[PDB]
Amino acid sequence: EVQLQQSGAELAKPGASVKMSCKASGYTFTSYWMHWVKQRPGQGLEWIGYINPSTGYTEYNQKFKDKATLTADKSSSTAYMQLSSLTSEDSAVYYCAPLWPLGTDYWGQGTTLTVSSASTKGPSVFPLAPSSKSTSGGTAALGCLVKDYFPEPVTVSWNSGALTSGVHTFPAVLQSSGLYSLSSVVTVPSSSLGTQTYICNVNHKPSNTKVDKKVEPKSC
Amino acid sequence: DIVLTQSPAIMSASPGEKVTMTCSASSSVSYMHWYQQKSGTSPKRWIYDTSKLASGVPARFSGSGSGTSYSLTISSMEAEDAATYYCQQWSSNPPTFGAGTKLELKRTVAAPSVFIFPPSDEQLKSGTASVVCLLNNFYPREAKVQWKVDNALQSGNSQESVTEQDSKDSTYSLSSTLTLSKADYEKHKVYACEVTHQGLRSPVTKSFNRGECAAAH
Ligand SMILES: OC[C@H]1O[C@@H](O)[C@H](O)[C@@H](O)[C@@H]1O
């Protein structure tokens, strides 16, 4: 019923600016202060500031006074946040939330911001080949390494989606290069290695690259 | 600013177990709020004014405390209570949040299945070598994964990635990726991944010699 709709993900370069929105419905937009919070993985939650949409008054965390600018438009029931002079430390998920006064417990779905000087690039897909080094007794492991792509996300399936059991697709890691990398692995019965074929369908479409790589039982 | 320290940072609880997490404040606060965040979703107000449950929060949840010491308690742990809980104060400006307590499901110990993957011929052609070590379906999360290249312990050239707790068997899976230049890779022979974990009576090693594995060279 009550809804806080935040604008879609944003990609920006260092030193650029970005402005994000937070559309409120299901409650009196003017009766609640709109707070903004920043979340990075491995970090907690950071309170940026709030705006009173009724009066336009804003308070800021001193840590974000020169970084964030909070606006509100009553006629559209929309609060806005602008972030200037962007650095890699500004890459995060940003939530809007009517934290005060009490009464509305919901937050917005969040806006993900990634700021990076990296260029769009499709991944290279390398096989993680099964063999004796990848076999316990009757179970063998194989996979695909999805390396050196930008930006998030990539989608990986196995045998066009026919194989889901035992699939582990790890979270992407941002390498020092500025490109992302992950591996997707699957465990299968070792007897089926030389008889049944395993192909991973790796997809990253900001670069519109789609690759299916056959992972094959290599001999050690 | 008032600094909020939540303890423990990560904890695991069995079904039906009583669980208590603490939120400590660097200076006295009069009230404490609590938010629940499930993975990949937004936080939601869970407890307000120290002890008042938000609407729709089940009765097994409670909060208490005063001064510099507050806590959130679940009388009987249930699977849907797995989440991260953040405390927050506003007796002082600016309002501050704790770093969260990640509450996960405790299950029996399960030893990891370990697999090592030598680099593909395609990537060696491109001039880099990635060696991947896989720890599959284990519990608890803590695991020591050491890379040794001709008995030399590696540092700063590997990175770990861990899945979320599996929805069905509550295990984790982990990948350790050792990244080397093709030049350094061909300068050594033995590449080993050694895994120490509570579920192994002794550490397990998966290794290969660059050369007992067929390749382009
Ligand atoms: O926001 C805290 C609580 O305030 C009360 O006024 C509302 O009835 C609840 O829905 C809400 O959970």
The span from the CA of A85 to the CA of A163, in Å, is 45
Is A211:A202 a contact under the CB 8 Å cutoff? yes
- Number of domains within chain A: 2
Look at A47 and B99 and tell me if their CB atoms are within 8 Å.
no
The span from the CA of A183 to the CA of A171, in Å, is 8
Range of the structural domain that residue A215 is part of: 114-220
The number of residues making up chain B comes to 217
Q: Which residues, including other chains, have CB under 8 Å from residue B209's CB and lie 6 or more apart?
A: B189, B190, B191
Is B212:A220 a contact under the CB 8 Å cutoff? yes
Are residues B126 and B216 located together in one domain of the fold? Answer: yes
* Chain-centroid distance, C-alpha B8: 13
Residue B22: exposure state from Cβ atoms within 10 A (0-12, 13-18, ≥19): middle
The span from the CA of A22 to the CA of A72, in Å, is 9
Ligand 1 atom nearest residue B55's Cα: 12
The resolution in angstroms reads 2.4
Q: Which domain CATH number covers B95?
A: 2.60.40.10
Strands (E), B50-127: 52-53, 61-74, 83-89, 96-97, 101-105, 113-117
Ligand 1: does its nearest atom lie under 6 Å from the Cβ of B45? yes
The span from the CA of A109 to the CA of A23, in Å, is 11
The span from the CA of A151 to the CA of A87, in Å, is 16
Are residues B128 and B207 located together in one domain of the fold? Answer: yes
Q: Which structural technique was applied?
A: X-ray
The number of residues making up chain A comes to 220
Q: Residue A28 carries which side chain, given as an amino acid letter?
A: T
Range of the structural domain that residue B65 is part of: 1-107
The span from the CA of B104 to the CA of B166, in Å, is 11
Is A16:A75 a contact under the CB 8 Å cutoff? no
Could you tell me which chain A residue has the CA closest to the CA of B163? A170
Tokens of B116: 């090592």
Best interface-test mutation with B: which of A33, A94, A128, A177 has the largest number of B CBs within 10 A? A128
The span from the CA of B121 to the CA of B185, in Å, is 13
Are residues A143 and A189 located together in one domain of the fold? Answer: yes
**Domain end marker among A113, A142, A169:** A113
- B16 close to A (CB below 8 A): no
For residue B82, give the DSSP letter.
-
Q: How far is B45 from chain A (nearest CA, A)?
A: 5
Are residues B45 and B112 located together in one domain of the fold? Answer: no
Are residues A96 and A120 located together in one domain of the fold? Answer: no
- Number of domains within chain B: 2
- Residue identified by tokens 């937004």 is B42
Measured at the CA of A169, the angle between CA A216 and CA A129, to 5 degrees, comes to 20
3-class secondary structure, A209:
strand
B11: phi then psi, degrees, rounded to nearest 5: -145, 155
Are residues B95 and B124 located together in one domain of the fold? Answer: no
Which residue has the least CA distance to atom 10 on ligand 1? B55
A115: phi then psi, degrees, rounded to nearest 5: -110, 125
Are residues B181 and B85 located together in one domain of the fold? Answer: no
The span from the CA of B134 to the CA of B145, in Å, is 10
Q: Residue B28 carries which side chain, given as an amino acid letter?
A: S
3-class secondary structure, A191:
helix
3-class secondary structure, B122:
helix
The span from the CA of A156 to the CA of A205, in Å, is 12
Are residues B183 and B100 located together in one domain of the fold? Answer: no
Look at B86 and A44 and tell me if their CB atoms are within 8 Å.
yes
Best interface-test mutation with B: which of A186, A198, A220 has the largest number of B CBs within 10 A? A220
The span from the CA of B44 to the CA of B41, in Å, is 9
Are residues A41 and A100 located together in one domain of the fold? Answer: yes
The span from the CA of B52 to the CA of B95, in Å, is 19
Helices (H), chain B: 121-126, 182-185
Is B124:B185 a contact under the CB 8 Å cutoff? yes
3-class secondary structure, B124:
helix
The span from the CA of B2 to the CA of A121, in Å, is 43
